[PDB]
Design a binder for this molecule. Structure first.
Ligand code: HEC
Ligand code: HEC
Ligand code: HEC
Ligand code: HEC
Ligand code: HEC
Ligand code: HEC
Ligand code: HEC
Ligand code: HEC
Ligand code: HEC
Ligand code: HEC
Ligand code: HEC
Ligand code: HEC
Ligand code: HEC
Ligand code: HEC
Ligand SMILES: *[C@H]1O[C@H](CO)[C@@H](O)[C@H](O[C@@H]2O[C@H](CO)[C@@H](O)[C@@H](O)[C@H]2NC(C)=O)[C@H]1NC(C)=O
Ligand SMILES: [Zn+2]
Ligand SMILES: [Zn+2]
Ligand SMILES: [Zn+2]
Length: 516
């Protein structure tokens, strides 16, 4: 839980460790040192305004010997000189005070600091306001590429994108015999140094301590503008994603014979706002990443090396990831408390046969070849998406029983369960109705009903739970309980997912104790 926890293992690049791991606590220290009216330079070399976030050095020593001695030295040097103030400061033979063993860096578990589109926009405005320039001139402040034939780092206008396309978890080989620093290292050097030097210049700034970037609670407090500006890199507003062979033009030669279940009209513009960043989809790869169209060179009907042989279908369909359409949507439906009551118990391993047609369009040609340029795809799509721009439907309340008393099950111990059926259906619907994804993929008004009344044709008079769950045991499938289990698992299961009362232990909340 400790986002300020740093696991110092700098010296394992030399091979197996001799000792249990160190775990330095950045806040204990920053708190202590800010008391002593001592700033960051107490532990970090400042070179022309810019701090290094290496501990008490600018270079890493080249033997284990030297590194470990430099650590010990600089660590215990300050301890020695604050013995008066902090007599409890670990001393040297006190191996376990520093080598405490296994650790978790809190920040590795908490959610990532990122510049989402709204926050990114604030940085563009602030940087522009600082350099007293028009927004398009701000980018050079932060975005760069290495020029081999110029020996330095330059701003490549029109090549901006996520830092992670070069700054990765395991750093890439530089050109060059050095590394491109990791995401973690590039981010700290970059983000915090700028935040520090703007707090110094006493302008409005961002966080410099661990808790400010790495706890959900600080993240939640970050200011958002009322409007998010468009971050425009040549993306379409809508495009048609179609089976066939696509050249870098965006041109696809399509054989309509080969193309079923049908082209997908994708709302790119809506997604930038639904997702709130670009990299979640235009993901970093082992070697790089780009804002490139997924399907041109990387994800093909067959599967190319450039996309690790992940096919078009797979890149759209794969479960268990947020990079694909179905993967992201089902990730959300199962994570959100308002969706998870119906979605968590659904099977997690197959794509639903009901879902195909909510993405794949009908009524395109079923044979013939056609060349579709980029602009014709994007035009057709925008027209398909607006023409569905549909009032979604729910079941008239008069068709939804109001309240039910359930008395299916002597040697009993409980009265009949009272069950506020219409009010629950209303709450579930009113919350799903906030989600354009729910409203689209629900389709029919009867669908939501199926979250409880499942495994049968949708109906306004669905069968009784007993009709399937009171069947003899040898007739039920393995995950098809008897009737008490059906009710308990579905009722209580949803209450536990959605965090609603009565809780599983609040027996009497559903059924009052019996009068024997
Ligand atoms: C008690 C006298 C010991 C012993 C036997 C060791 N240490 Fe330390 N140690 C500290 C820090 C910040 C590092 C760098 C960590 C890293 O980069 O991996 C180390 C590292 C070591 C090593 C080399 C790594 C290894 O386990 O092989 C060794 C051999 C080692 N230590 C032994 C910090 C501290 C302290 C904080 C003030 C204290 C006290 C100690 N170490 C004490 C000891
Ligand atoms: C000048 C108007 C620009 C343009 C055209 C872009 N940027 Fe930035 N940017 C910065 C950082 C740290 C990131 C990554 C943040 C993260 O991954 O959490 C980005 C990201 C982008 C993207 C991709 C956005 C995405 O969500 O994938 C793009 C297309 C982009 N940038 C273009 C840092 C900065 C700045 C420092 C405060 C400045 C100024 C800019 N970027 C400016 C621009
Ligand atoms: C954040 C503001 C962005 C930006 C700057 C871009 N995207 Fe996307 N995008 C997605 C998909 C599936 C496509 C492919 C459609 C196809 O194969 O043609 C694209 C396409 C692009 C482009 C290229 C357009 C071209 O003609 O080559 C560009 C420059 C682009 N995008 C930028 C998918 C997504 C997302 C999935 C939910 C979201 C989020 C983003 N993109 C966000 C952004
Ligand atoms: C356009 C916005 C997309 C979409 C929707 C996907 N990709 Fe890629 N992909 C590439 C590589 C090299 C891999 C293997 C792992 C890696 O190197 O990161 C993948 C993997 C995927 C997945 C599977 C899970 C995952 O996120 O890793 C999915 C669902 C997926 N992709 C979808 C390569 C590339 C690119 C390199 C030229 C391009 C561009 C894209 N992919 C674009 C997209
Ligand atoms: C809290 C830990 C408990 C305990 C000990 C029991 N329940 Fe429930 N229960 C619920 C429903 C819809 C039924 C079918 C009702 C009926 O037709 O009588 C039941 C049934 C039972 C039984 C068997 C019936 C009997 O009268 O003995 C038993 C032993 C039982 N329950 C124990 C629904 C709920 C809840 C709805 C959200 C929750 C909470 C509970 N039950 C909690 C408990
Ligand atoms: C590839 C086109 C890159 C992108 C996108 C980003 N960076 Fe970068 N970065 C890249 C290289 C090749 C290097 C130098 C590697 C070396 O051999 O030294 C860097 C360096 C940095 C640094 C360190 C500067 C130093 O004194 O060493 C920082 C702080 C940094 N990069 C940050 C950064 C940010 C914030 C980016 C997105 C906004 C970003 N980089 C993108 C290559 C590429
Ligand atoms: C200048 C070169 C910056 C770099 C690079 C990064 N940040 Fe920044 N940050 C900067 C400024 C001038 C401001 C204030 C914006 C304004 O209103 O004028 C900020 C603000 C933030 C905040 C907001 C804090 C809040 O609103 O409560 C955050 C969370 C933030 N900055 C984070 C951040 C991250 C994560 C960065 C790298 C990925 C980053 N900043 C880079 C200046 C600069
Ligand atoms: C997250 C990383 C997503 C990916 C990748 C894709 N979708 Fe998505 N979609 C997502 C959200 C969060 C939303 C609505 C906001 C909400 O909270 O409900 C949507 C919505 C849709 C919709 C319905 C609205 C519309 O665009 O018409 C559709 C049809 C949809 N998404 C389709 C779609 C396709 C075809 C995708 C991949 C090529 C895709 N989505 C990816 C979240 C994310
Ligand atoms: C019970 C009242 C439900 C609530 C709450 C939500 N969903 Fe739902 N969803 C429900 C059913 C019965 C189905 C049909 C599933 C089937 O197997 O046919 C769905 C379907 C979806 C889908 C499509 C799933 C897929 O196969 O790709 C999505 C993307 C979806 N639902 C999203 C979703 C969201 C985001 C919700 C909270 C805002 C939500 N659903 C609630 C039943 C119920
Ligand atoms: C779970 C939260 C439910 C959703 C959403 C809907 N229904 Fe339901 N319903 C549920 C239970 C546990 C029961 C009792 C079933 C039993 O075996 O006794 C019902 C009952 C009905 C009934 C029967 C009413 C009667 O008097 O016998 C009807 C006609 C019915 N439900 C319709 C219905 C519709 C139309 C729904 C969506 C609009 C719907 N239910 C949602 C659980 C849940
Ligand atoms: C999600 C798919 C649900 C399932 C299955 C069941 N319930 Fe539940 N329940 C759900 C919600 C979202 C709420 C709050 C509705 C509101 O706005 O108030 C409830 C509430 C109840 C209550 C308390 C009603 C109230 O005090 O307002 C009871 C007693 C209750 N639910 C019982 C119950 C039974 C007996 C179920 C199986 C027959 C059952 N619930 C299923 C969501 C879900
Ligand atoms: C001054 C510039 C210091 C440097 C450099 C290092 N430490 Fe420190 N340390 C310092 C103070 C003022 C304190 C007292 C804080 C307190 O809560 O009493 C400490 C304490 C520690 C501790 C003990 C924590 C506790 O008992 O709660 C440890 C384990 C520790 N320091 C380790 C440590 C390491 C590994 C350092 C170099 C990476 C290091 N310290 C440097 C002041 C200073
Ligand atoms: O995805 C699958 C496959 C097996 C199957 C079930 C399973 C359940 C479960 C297990 C979890 C799940 O949904 O997969 C539960 C908890 C369950 C409960 C249940 C309730 C509370 C019902 C009435 C509101 C209900 C009705 C019911 C009907 C009428 C069924 C047949 C027409 C039926 C079948 C069924 C199968 C084949 N069930 Fe159910 N159920 N059930 N049910 O579900
Ligand atoms: C008591 C010494 C000390 C003080 C003072 C100090 N730090 Fe550090 N900081 C460290 C140590 C140790 C590391 C781990 C780096 C290493 O092993 O070289 C670190 C790392 C960091 C990191 C990177 C963390 C990581 O895991 O990548 C950031 C960011 C940072 N410090 C910022 C600051 C800021 C801002 C201040 C001013 C409040 C500050 N530090 C003051 C000791 C200190
Ligand atoms: C771009 O994509 C393909 C590269 O593989 C080109 O062969 C493709 O064909 C062109 O289509 C144009 C439509 O405007 C024609 O003007 C014509 O130049 C043709 N080129 C040929 C047959 O060699 C290119 N399309 C576009 C829109 O640029
Ligand atoms: Zn266009
Ligand atoms: Zn009973
Ligand atoms: Zn729709």
């Amino acid at each position: 839980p400790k986002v300020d926890a740093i696991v110092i293992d700098t010296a394992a690049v030399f091979g197996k460790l001799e000792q249990p791991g160190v775990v330095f606590y950045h806040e204990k220290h920053t708190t202590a040192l800010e008391k002593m009216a001592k700033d960051c330079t107490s532990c970090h070399v400042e070179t022309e305004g810019k701090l290094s976030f290496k501990f008490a050095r600018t270079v890493d020593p080249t033997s284990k010997n030297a590194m470990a001695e430099q650590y010990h030295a600089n660590c215990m040097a300050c301890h020695e000189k604050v013995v008066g103030s902090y007599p409890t400061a670990p001393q040297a033979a006190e191996c376990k005070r520093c080598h405490v063993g296994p650790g978790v860096e809190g920040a590795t578990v908490t959610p990532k600091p990122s510049l989402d589109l709204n926050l990114h926009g604030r940085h563009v405005v602030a940087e522009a306001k600082r350099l007293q320039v028009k927004e398009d001139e701000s980018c050079k402040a932060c975005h760069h590429t290495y020029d081999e034939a110029q020996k330095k780092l330059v701003y490549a206008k029109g090549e901006e994108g996520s830092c992670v396309y070069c700054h990765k978890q395991e750093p890439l080989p530089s050109p060059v015999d050095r590394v491109v620093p990791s995401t973690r290292d590039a981010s700290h050097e970059s983000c915090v140094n700028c935040h520090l030097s703007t707090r110094k210049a006493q302008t409005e700034s961002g966080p410099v301590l661990c808790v400010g970037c790495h706890t959900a609670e600080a993240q939640a407090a970050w200011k958002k503008t009322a409007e998010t500006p468009r971050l425009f890199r040549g993306q379409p507003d809508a495009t048609l994603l179609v089976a066939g062979a696509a050249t870098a033009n965006g041109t696809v030669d399509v054989n309509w014979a080969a193309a079923g279940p049908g082209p997908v009209a994708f709302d790119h513009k809506a997604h930038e706002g639904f997702v709130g960043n670009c990299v979640t989809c235009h993901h970093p790869t082992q070697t790089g990443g780009s804002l490139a169209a997924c399907g041109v060179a990387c994800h093909t009907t067959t599967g190319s090396k450039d996309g690790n042989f992940v096919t078009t279908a797979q890149s759209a369909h794969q479960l268990g990831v947020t990079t694909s359409c179905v993967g992201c949507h089902t990730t959300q439906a199962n994570a959100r408390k308002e969706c998870a009551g119906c979605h968590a118990p659904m099977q997690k391993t197959a794509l639903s046969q009901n879902s195909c047609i909510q993405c794949h369009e009908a009524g395109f040609p079923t044979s013939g070849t056609q060349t579709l340029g980029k602009e014709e795809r994007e035009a057709t799509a925008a027209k398909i998406l607006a023409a569905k721009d549909e009032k979604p439907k729910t079941v008239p309340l008069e068709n939804v029983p109001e309240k039910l008393t359930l008395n299916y099950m002597k040697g009993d111990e409980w009265q009949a369960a009272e069950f506020p059926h219409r009010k629950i259906y209303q709450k579930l619907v009113e919350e799903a109705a906030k989600s354009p994804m729910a409203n689209h993929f629900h389709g029919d008004a009867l669908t939501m009903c199926s979250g409880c009344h499942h495994n049968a044709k949708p109906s306004l008079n669905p069968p009784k739970c007993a009709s399937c769950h009171s069947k003899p045991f040898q007739e039920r499938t393995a995950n098809q309980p008897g009737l008490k289990g059906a009710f308990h698992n579905q009722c209580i299961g949803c209450h536990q997912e959605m965090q609603v009362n009565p809780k599983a232990t609040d027996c009497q909340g559903c059924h009052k104790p019996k009068n024997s």
